[PDB]
Design a protein around this ligand. Structure first.
Ligand SMILES: [Zn+2]
Ligand SMILES: [Zn+2]
Ligand SMILES: [Zn+2]
Lengths: 142, 463, 202, 193
């Protein structure tokens, strides 16, 4: 059981080993709809570097539809300001390569290649509730 | 007698000779061949008093004044290149000396300089890297009030001059003029010198920023990310405030009143909807005066804030619609309050608290009031009446929440109040809603209250 | 070499300080020296190239807290074996630093590093003092280097290894623990894409 | 590119003294920015029409009056002398179609400037003419005119070339040339402009 608030695994791979099971074996519920994830979604949850949410010692993930939906709502709600990558580097005194930026549509962390694309196409990065976001390749093409 | 760098003594060599030969052209040759060169200047000295003596001697001759002017016009465009492409300051931190030398010239504010020389110099100066600006601002903060006034005036006259001389319209924005933008950035540099030069009380007056916990949805998304304890991030902070370590709110008393930094001609011409857009969305080719708030008057600022409030209200309306499309749930796009004339405080409390507890984001919707039993469309008049009633009821001595001073005609919090923390929360919310809906309230609080709201404790001087 | 050893516990434990890790999100191009996969919870890096690791805590640990790195084989049939640098690299002149030629892991840029051999399990470990984040930072970055290739015969010999990072007090008591898999290889971006694709195909 | 329109415009505008000072004061503002465009932004490589600017300015007949020589023309020379070679080639080919008196005017416009700066400044073994950006820039402009004069003259290239006969070097240099891959590459020409 994961009824200890502090000492339960956070990332799906860890939960796999903690339950002596593999990503190919495990079945999980989405934290909003409590519907079961498709295996494709489970993989993507691992790829998106997201955290397991726990209620009463039970683990929950998030499916694709819910994640996109709530992310889009959060964009509409806590948008702050948009900067160019160059400007952003100066505000944070670090190169964009190193700065933590996620996909605004699907939370997937952005690769330095995608970060470069933002600089190449003179596109801005959006601050939402104090965290920075951009658009990954799979969301700038749709 | 050619020389690569210049000093007071070197100048005196020529003062005497030029008088003795009844000429000035050799000294003009010299000064031109000197002051046209950034390197010569950077290498020449920090020796403030020497510079002051030199200017006090040289500017006494009209022929030499035109030479200074003509040298400065040649100098600045090259300095802009050094700062923009060669990062010279990062190679030699003495480069800042150049600007210090030029700024001690007392005649920069005469019209001859305002038309061309000073604009070009502003273009160059406004490109300095933040660390250099910080070095310069810290120096200026030691100057006398009249000198701050002079520097302020030097740029104020320029901003005024360019606003008056050029025709601005909805297609030709003040935001597109490099001269005014550069001048404003310079003036910002002076403004922070005024801030840091005033009385600053940082160690005995800070109050914690209390933030309302967001709705469960945003909480779950924050939990799904690594942000469970990172709820406190602060608003958009000005880079110079970071470099200087002192906020505009920390200065208790400036050297020159902040109101003198307001440029009324500029405010009469500035289109705030577009400025707010440029404030929200950074564009390489356009500036935003909201990044320089000291220059805007309260009307112009309020119009910016009103655009923020309206854009948010409209965002919440979009969210309402999106929720209805995806989950079928029907949420109200307005902050619809329904209250009874005999129970205004109670009805308003229960409703605003149920709203704050069920969804703290709802308080950011457009206010709409309905008196139970009355019928009309709230075009603001019903809201205004609601505010009058609430304010009158809350300040009645029979409720005991506030004490009224006959002398100042101001209200202050009753320490002995047994009333619940609810009513105090209600009056707080009402003030918020009033700003959000641009409605004036007949409330009479002493300055300490607005300081405490901003997160600064009241100090002895606020009594 | 020591032919047997006890098995250190590998279970993640955030403890009273919320101890968790982070990694700079890197691409998969042919030129990448180091790159991390969240799906595999796995680090792919080139021999003796810098691998940056971020440390995250909810509250600052007590003074004298330390950060220890220890390596074990991931496969249960080998968990009792000590991970040692492969003999050809144990024989290489590159061990000119302050770490034993048999130590696989080395720390770059921090001279307060202690290369420690477990007196009871003989396992090789690297320890540094814990350092709070820099002004303006949320996390502390440490730089690790792996001095042997996972494919090495007589050493790792293609067996996957798990790096366990432990947050400890000045006496070695466990304040927090987390872990991740490592693959030292000539072409990280390629190998990462390969293992990730194999995972997605399953 | 509308040369004749420019000429008409100048012929009408320069008839008013107040407007002359405005042209001068605008040119002094313009050139230092153009130098930046050419030196840091390579604007011509983005828009080959950028050359139009210089053509427009050069049709001003008053550039050679002293008021221009002291500041406006030097600054304009600093900008112009930075043009990339291909642009200079485009400009020179245009000038080579002008009348002799116009070449003379342009030549004179820079000659007066070089003369003015040489006479106005004190040059010595420590202050070399080589260190003055104004004279160097002016000279590079004048070079631009010079080649216009060359190309605008009578040129006979197809019936008059004779082969460059070079004396074979001493055996030592020959052996070194043979040890390198240069057995047949004895003909390389002097430093070409
Ligand atoms: Zn779901
Ligand atoms: Zn995406
Ligand atoms: Zn090896």
């Amino acid at each position: 059981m994961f009824q200890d608030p502090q000492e339960r695994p956070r990332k799906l791979p860890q939960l796999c080993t903690e339950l002596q099971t593999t990503i190919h074996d495990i079945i999980l519920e989405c934290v909003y709809c409590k519907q079961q994830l498709l295996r494709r979604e489970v993989y993507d949850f691992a790829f998106r570097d997201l955290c397991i949410v726990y209620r009463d010692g039970n683990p929950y993930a998030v499916c694709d539809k819910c994640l996109k939906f709530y992310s889009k709502i959060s964009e509409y709600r806590h948008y702050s300001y948009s900067l160019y990558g160059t400007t952003l580097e100066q505000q944070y005194n670090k190169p964009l390569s190193d700065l933590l930026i996620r996909c605004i549509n699907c939370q997937k962390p952005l690769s330095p290649e995608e970060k470069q694309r933002h600089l190449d196409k003179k596109q801005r990065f959006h601050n939402i509730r104090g965290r920075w976001t951009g658009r990954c390749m799979s969301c700038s093409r749709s | 007698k050619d020389v690569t760098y210049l000093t007071e003594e070197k100048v005196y060599e020529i003062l005497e000779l030029c008088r003795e030969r009844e000429d000035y052209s050799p000294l003009i040759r010299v000064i031109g061949r000197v002051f046209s060169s950034a390197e010569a200047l950077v290498q020449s000295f920090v020796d403030i008093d020497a510079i002051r003596r030199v200017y006090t001697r040289l500017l006494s001759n009209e022929k030499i004044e035109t030479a200074f002017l003509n040298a400065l016009v040649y100098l600045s465009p090259n300095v802009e290149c050094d700062l923009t492409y060669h990062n010279v300051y990062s190679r030699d931190p003495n480069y800042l000396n150049l600007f210090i030398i030029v700024m001690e010239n007392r005649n920069l504010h005469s019209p001859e300089y305002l038309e061309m020389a000073l604009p070009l110099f502003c273009k160059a100066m406004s490109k300095l890297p933040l660390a250099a600006q910080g070095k310069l601002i810290r120096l200026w903060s030691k100057y006398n009030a009249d000198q701050i006034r002079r520097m302020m005036e030097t740029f104020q006259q320029l901003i005024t001059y360019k606003v008056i001389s050029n025709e601005f319209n909805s297609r030709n924005l003040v935001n597109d003029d490099d001269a005014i933008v550069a001048a404003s950035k310079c003036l910002k540099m002076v403004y922070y010198a005024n801030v840091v030069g005033g009385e600053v009380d940082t160690n005995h007056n800070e109050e914690d920023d209390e933030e309302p916990i967001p709705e469960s949805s945003e909480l779950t998304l924050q939990e799904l990310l690594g942000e469970e304890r990172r709820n406190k991030k602060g608003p958009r902070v000005d880079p110079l405030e970071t470099e200087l370590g002192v906020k505009t709110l920390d200065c208790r008393k400036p050297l020159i009143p902040f109101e003198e930094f307001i440029n009324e001609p500029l405010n009469e011409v500035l289109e705030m909807d577009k400025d707010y857009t440029f404030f929200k969305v950074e564009t390489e080719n356009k500036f935003s005066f909201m990044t320089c708030p000291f220059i805007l008057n309260a009307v112009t600022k309020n119009l910016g804030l009103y655009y923020d409030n309206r854009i948010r209200m409209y965002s919440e309306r979009r969210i309402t619609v999106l929720y209805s499309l995806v989950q079928g749930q029907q949420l109200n796009p307005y902050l619809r309050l329904k209250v009874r004339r005999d129970h205004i405080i109670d009805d308003a409390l229960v409703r605003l608290e149920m709203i704050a507890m069920e969804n703290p984001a709802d308080l950011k919707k457009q206010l709409y009031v309905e008196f139970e039993g009355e019928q009309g469309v709230d075009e603001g008049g019903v809201s205004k009446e609601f505010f009058q009633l609430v304010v009158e009821e809350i300040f009645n001595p029979d409720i005991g929440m506030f004490t009224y001073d006959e002398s100042t005609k101001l209200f202050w919090f009753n320490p002995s109040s047994f009333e619940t923390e609810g009513q105090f929360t209600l009056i707080g919310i009402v003030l918020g809603l009033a700003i959000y809906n641009n409605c004036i309230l007949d409330v009479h609080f002493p300055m300490v209250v607005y300081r405490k709201l901003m997160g600064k404790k009241g100090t002895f001087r606020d009594l | 070499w020591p032919l047997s050893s006890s098995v250190p516990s590998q279970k993640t434990y955030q403890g009273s300080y919320g101890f968790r890790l982070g990694f700079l999100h890197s691409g998969t191009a042919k030129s990448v020296t180091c790159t991390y996969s969240p799906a595999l919870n796995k680090m792919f890096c080139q021999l003796a190239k810098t691998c940056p690791v971020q440390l995250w805590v909810d509250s600052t640990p007590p003074p004298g807290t330390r950060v220890r790195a220890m390596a074990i084989y991931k496969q249960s049939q080998h968990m009792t074996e000590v991970v040692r640098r492969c003999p050809h690299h144990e024989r290489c002149s590159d061990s000119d630093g302050l770490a034993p030629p048999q130590h696989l892991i080395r720390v770059e840029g921090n001279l307060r590093v202690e290369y420690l051999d477990d007196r009871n399990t003989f396992r090789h470990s690297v320890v540094v003092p814990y350092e709070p984040p820099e002004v303006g930072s949320d996390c502390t970055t440490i730089h690790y280097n792996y001095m042997c290739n996972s494919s090495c015969m007589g050493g790792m010999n293609r067996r996957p290894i798990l790096t366990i990072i432990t947050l400890e007090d000045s006496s070695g008591n466990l304040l927090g623990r987390n872990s991740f898999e490592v693959r030292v290889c000539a072409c990280p971006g390629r190998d990462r894409r390969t293992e990730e694709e194999n995972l997605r195909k399953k």
